[PDB]
Design a binder for this molecule. Sequence first.
Ligand code: CLA
Ligand code: CLA
Ligand code: CLA
Ligand code: CLA
Ligand code: CLA
Ligand SMILES: CC1=C(C/C=C(\C)CCC[C@H](C)CCC[C@H](C)CCCC(C)C)C(=O)c2ccccc2C1=O
Ligand SMILES: CCCCCCCS[C@@H]1O[C@H](CO)[C@@H](O)[C@H](O)[C@H]1O
Ligand code: SF4
Ligand code: SF4
Lengths: 88, 163, 80, 155, 142, 32, 740
Amino acid sequence: RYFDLDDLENTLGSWDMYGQEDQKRYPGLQNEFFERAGESLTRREAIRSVLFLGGGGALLAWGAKGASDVTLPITVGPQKGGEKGPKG
Amino acid sequence: DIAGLTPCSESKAFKRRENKEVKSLQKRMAKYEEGSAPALALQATAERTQKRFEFYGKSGLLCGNDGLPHLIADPGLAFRYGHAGDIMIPTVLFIYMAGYTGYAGREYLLATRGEKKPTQKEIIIDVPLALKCVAGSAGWPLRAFNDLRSGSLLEKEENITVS
Amino acid sequence: SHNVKIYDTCIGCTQCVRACPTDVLEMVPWDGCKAKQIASAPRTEDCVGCKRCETACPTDFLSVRVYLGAETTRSMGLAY
Amino acid sequence: KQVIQPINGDPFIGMLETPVTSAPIVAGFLSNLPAYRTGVSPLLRGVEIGLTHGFLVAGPFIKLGPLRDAAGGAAETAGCLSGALLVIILTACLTIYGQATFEDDEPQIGVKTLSGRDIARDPLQSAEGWNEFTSGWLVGGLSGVAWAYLCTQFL
Amino acid sequence: TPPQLDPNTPSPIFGGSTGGLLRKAQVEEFYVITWEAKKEQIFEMPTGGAAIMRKGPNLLKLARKEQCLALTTQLRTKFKTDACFYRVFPSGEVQYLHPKDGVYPEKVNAGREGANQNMRSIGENVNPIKVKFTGKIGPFDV
Amino acid sequence: MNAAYLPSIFVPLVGLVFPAIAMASAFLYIEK
Amino acid sequence: KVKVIVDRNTTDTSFEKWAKPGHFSRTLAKGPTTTTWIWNLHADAHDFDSHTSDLEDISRKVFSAHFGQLGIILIWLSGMYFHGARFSNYEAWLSDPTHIKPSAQVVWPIVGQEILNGDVGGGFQGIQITSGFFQLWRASGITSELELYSTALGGLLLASAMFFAGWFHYHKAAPKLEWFQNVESMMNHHLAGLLGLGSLGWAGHQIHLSIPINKLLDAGVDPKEIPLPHEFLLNRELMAGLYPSFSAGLKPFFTLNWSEYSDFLTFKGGLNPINGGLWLTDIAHHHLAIAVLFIIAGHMYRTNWGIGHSMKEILESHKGPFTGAGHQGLYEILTNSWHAQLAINLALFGSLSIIVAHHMYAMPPYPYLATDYGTQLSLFTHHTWIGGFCIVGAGAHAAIFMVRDYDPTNNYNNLLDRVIRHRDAIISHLNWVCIFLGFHSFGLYIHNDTMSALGRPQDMFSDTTIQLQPIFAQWIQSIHYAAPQLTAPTASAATSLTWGGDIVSVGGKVAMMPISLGTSDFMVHHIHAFTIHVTALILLKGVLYSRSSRLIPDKANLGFRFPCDGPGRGGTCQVSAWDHVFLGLFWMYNSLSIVIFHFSWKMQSDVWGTVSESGVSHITGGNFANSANAINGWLRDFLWAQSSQVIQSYGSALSAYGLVFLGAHFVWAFSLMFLFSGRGYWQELIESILWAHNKLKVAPAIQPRALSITQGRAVGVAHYIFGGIVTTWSFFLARIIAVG
Ligand code: CLA
Ligand code: CLA
Ligand code: CLA
Ligand code: CLA
Ligand code: CLA
Ligand SMILES: CC1=C(C/C=C(\C)CCC[C@H](C)CCC[C@H](C)CCCC(C)C)C(=O)c2ccccc2C1=O
Ligand SMILES: CCCCCCCS[C@@H]1O[C@H](CO)[C@@H](O)[C@H](O)[C@H]1O
Ligand code: SF4
Ligand code: SF4
């Protein structure tokens, strides 16, 4: 027998298992520096898009620019002699 | 001759084709002293195989470039140019072979039809009733025409359809 | 929600109503039948689509024909 | 006795408690993690959680990358840069999961503790609590790879 | 007469299993069974495993109306007891499902007004042209 | 061909960037 | 308590009921309404739970029908000895085994098929033999043809004794239930009577026949001078010449010093470097040592006399804290139901076959199995598959127990109970293990495939490249080649040569050399592991969800074998517990098939081939660990390369493999018709053809109906597996019979 139908919260076993009560266990010495470093980007579509538009541009940038390419047909690549078929 | 072919008897690759087989066969039977049946069994096949060559050359089959005998379908070609035995004759043989078992299957279903329960009569055949049909089926060409013209071959329009 | 609709042909055998695992079909009394009984489907909600109905109809061509519609939380039968 | 029981009373709930579910140790450990606590800001978790996952992800790249031969330490930065991408990619994923599940208007859907007590729902549910976490993840996620590099060229 | 509320009827003895409720029950509806007992014995549980039903009126919580009638067909046809069940969902209100008329649908009663019937034989249905671009779910609606 | 630096600019943009954006935006539109 | 307790004249032996097909089950007795009644007959014929109810009627039918199988096996063994008698070349093989290839079957000349007779040896023409009878019959000390006729008759005679036993124990004198309920007697007897005595009896054949004979052969005599078998046990002074300790008689056995027999009872290990087999002296010391140990182990169960255990106590006295009531239910399950006791048997007795396939391979216990490679291969592939099916038998019948024979009232908070209850955990974790190995086991080839094609060999996992080596397996082979020092102090040498031993030759062939485990060996075992897990997922899921799943709560009441429940719920198609065996057979097929391709081409790479003296050049020239890392080289170096033996044979002796090779493609591709299609299209099409027969009034009275759903699924698996195994059958034999 269980019931307490007045509460459907305890009938579902939905209880959060490993969630604790304890408040912040973290030091104020390092608190006040990060807590103000996170909200510089708080916003939905004007920031996530910065990651797509501005963030993914290093594929563009250092894919073309920096000469660290390894065996890339981009840059170093073909430098050796080209293969010719039997017929032509 | 016909279709750029030649009779296999006057062919050439066909004559290679016959005399290359015996060589590979006899060089094999030199490994068995005559006191062995394998010396006899291989021998008998070499003589068996040469018989068919003198048969295929004689009968007048047409070997193309490869030397392998071909056939010819058209009646007007087989007949007039003399070799119809390839299909034109056996295409008559088959039909009488096939229709015989074909029409012998229809009578049995008729004879076994009217009963209390024809179903058990299909599983378990009464061979006498099936024998009387296997006998009666012969000359089905003349017995098919008659069920055809008398109107007893078809079941007409009480068949079932859908829409 | 699936659609289920019933036809004149019912004998009222109840053999559908015994089939439904969600107990949709429910026998409503009637007149023109031999046994004077006709099924009917008050819940199209909970027809899952098993078509255990259509198997049970003794009628030649069915008295019930389930027409599958879209499928909700119930009509998908989700425990998730 | 019998060691294994259904979770906390009712047997008809899906899971059932076992030694890796309800124990002295496992109850405490999984609860100590910067995950389940209800008493710390979500910004502070991302700077914790993401801070770690940058360091350990660098390793595979900075060790077993496409280019594992360089005389300038470029084999190490080639992994740092790419390991810094899964920092930048997952930020897109994290933030995306916020605009989907959580509506700015809808309240926190988290449930209430383990036993008898209803305690204030997870401060991270809605987009506000979530987005503060995402930027937090990005703040730490950069550090982890960074200190991974510093630990590569030093220490 | 037919409807009833949810008094306190205990739950049958069982030791827990992975079959049972899930995070539907939090946000979504879930069902409840109430039957009675005479002797105590064991019954198949549809969510898996076996369970001991008490000596008297019992109450269960299942995850599906499907699972629910599995257990009524169980006890009605085997231990020969009646059962009736409910639809419970978190907003707090409960509905009475199953013989809303007070009688199992298998058997005729009066007062039932049946829906979803057609007064035509199947072959008498409309062909799909005659509902075109006007629209209906199908030829059976029209 | 004289343009040679283009493929390095486009292919990453069209093999990754566009499939990154069209992965995000097409997702956010599945649920509203 | 343990008595005989039989009935009398139970049934009536007559043809009354043969003429009434379907007489057994109440549903079939009504004769065919449709064509399905013809099919529904056969599937229900051997299902004895549908026939009847009580275990008296079931068990009698079961027990009396085991005589049937044994009466068939003996007609089979008799036939195999007979064709060794008349049609085999055996004598010629027996004199010069290092050359002559084994043959029995002989082809009648007609229809130009006598070309199948190959020139083999001993002035003979016939089919090759991969079975390995000849290399058994040497180890049994059978020389002349007369011993074979005596087995053929004696085998065919005792076969007739079985069917009479089969008749006698069903119609005439049929035991009761209580008789079949005695396990502890049955287990005392089988373990002591069959295996205990049957080992001594054989340990008494080897000592007085094979050990003496097989010494006279490899000594260089031939069957013409070999004394008759009864000369050996009826002459001591003849026997004592071979082994001097027979002059000691039975005293050393009785005076209790057995070191006396160290001449003809040894402990050696290793292969005999003349015949290649295991030294036949210790094999007698083998069976003897086992037989003594079985008869011991048959006495642990009490019957009449109150000495020895019972079962019910052994099980019900084990209760752990985790497991609740432990085993209290298992006894009355396993004595009250056949399918339960069948799933347990097919499980082990299936996988025991696969185990045999490794041992007979790794340490061949027959003279001259090495010089014939087709036999060692054909017996590794044979026993695996036969062990592969009998495992899926366990998957199928365990599911049959759940659906049918399982009742809750007996087992409550049991080990069986507590499994059904958490099942969602078991299946979920196993389902994760597969996905894990899926990418790691298999995917590493795709890396190796790709990194190749991109021209960067520095990357692909290999020996020169990234090292992944089987540390443990390598490390195991270290112990066993160091074993005959301390952990095995009394030995000639290590057990087998696959360990760190040295190569062994016969007839210019490699008996067995060691095998080295490299990276490519590592990567494969995890693919073996990947398949063996995935195919466990499917069968376990079939057992645990047989009763009812979360989505279908009633599932038991739909039977063991049923099609979908609905089209509803997104469709239930193929949810039943017969249908998880449907799926298990494609993973069994897949699992074992690659077990072989691992074997066959590892064994050709790193073992087989002629002894070249210098170089010991193998068949493939030792390309495996380099050759196959990626899926790259499995097409080229294996299927493509190896298959150029079968294709070029027409007009040759083995050409019948070239036909079967394709013939196994046609039947395989033909299977896809039944798997991909569905019934209702085929039942609609038959509706048309009936219009043709109707129009000609030829309509049959047994109405044609298309195959049932699960019917079409079975005939789909029947061919997909059939046609697919028959390829490798034709692909191996044509390969090695040419090469080996
Ligand atoms: C003996 C009875 C009989 C007869 C008269 C026919 C006659 C016919 N069948 Mg048919 N059929 C039969 C038996 C028979 N069938 C059986 C037993 C089967 C399979 C179980 C089929 C399967 C079948 C198919 C699938 C099709 C036909 C078709 C046809 C028609 C074209 C003929 C043809 O090409 O068939 C070719 C025949 C076959 C491909 C298979 C036949 C195999 C043999 C003949 C069945 C054995 C006969 C039986 C043992 C005789 C017992 C004799 C004894 C009792 C006295 C024709 C009306 C075709 C059609 O409708 O086209 C118009 C068609 O598509 N039949
Ligand atoms: C058009 C498609 C495309 C392109 C351009 C690339 C390009 C690349 N792949 Mg890749 N890949 C692709 C499809 C593609 N991939 C697909 C479909 C698969 C799966 C089948 C893979 C699987 C794969 C693997 C498994 C690996 C690569 C690697 C690489 C790198 C080659 C090695 C190298 O020089 O790294 C050296 C790289 C650098 C020195 C620096 C690169 C860092 C850039 C400049 C910063 C990018 C900024 C931006 C935030 C990135 C996120 C984009 C997103 C936010 C929009 C290169 C960046 C290798 C790699 O990433 O290792 C490094 C590697 O191991 N690929
Ligand atoms: C399962 C084991 C087995 C197998 C696979 C074979 C297979 C073969 N044997 Mg063989 N044989 C066996 C056991 C076996 N035998 C045993 C146990 C003996 C000792 C008795 C023999 C003795 C034997 C001889 C002496 C010969 C063969 C031959 C052959 C070959 C051709 C047989 C043939 O065409 O049949 C011929 C078929 C018939 C004569 C009739 C078939 C149809 C009849 C009517 C069926 C009988 C009815 C019923 C179903 C069976 C008996 C029941 C009864 C109560 C009515 C073939 C390779 C021959 C061979 O290889 O030649 C080189 C040959 O000469 N065998
Ligand atoms: C020493 C005693 C002894 C021995 C040797 C056996 C031997 C056997 N029993 Mg068995 N059994 C015994 C006592 C014994 N039983 C007792 C006391 C019971 C009562 C509980 C049973 C109940 C029992 C059942 C229920 C079954 C067996 C089965 C079997 C067979 C195993 C299957 C197999 O692969 O056989 C391999 C076969 C051989 C190696 C061939 C040798 C066979 C010859 C004929 C020796 C048989 C001797 C046996 C004791 C009968 C002798 C007495 C009789 C002649 C009057 C095998 C023939 C199974 C079987 O096959 O059923 C038929 C089976 O299902 N037994
Ligand atoms: C070649 C054909 C094929 C393949 C690849 C699979 C693959 C799979 N089957 Mg399977 N199956 C097949 C045929 C096949 N099946 C057939 C013919 C049948 C009929 C009987 C079945 C029946 C069957 C059953 C019954 C079961 C499976 C299961 C599985 C899964 C096992 C887990 C696993 O390995 O995932 C790992 C994935 C792989 C090994 C695929 C390799 C691909 C590479 C490594 C990854 C690619 C990288 C990247 C994503 C590239 C994409 C990027 C791009 C989008 C730009 C897996 C998805 C089991 C399952 O799901 O449970 C675990 C299961 O229960 N299958
Ligand atoms: C091809 C196919 C068919 C059609 C195949 C059928 C109907 C098989 C019927 C052919 C049988 C074998 C013909 C039997 C002939 C009789 C035995 C008579 C022979 C008498 C002598 C000639 C021996 C299905 O019915 C089906 C159903 C469900 C899923 C898949 C499929 C499927 O794939
Ligand atoms: C002899 C070989 C051919 C086998 C068939 C011969 C018997 S013919 C047999 O005769 C029986 C007489 O009662 C009938 O019942 C049965 O229907 C009929 O088929
Ligand atoms: S629907 Fe079919 S089954 Fe249900 S009542 Fe009417 S007739 Fe009987
Ligand atoms: S299909 Fe819909 S209606 Fe027919 S039985 Fe299943 S649920 Fe009841």
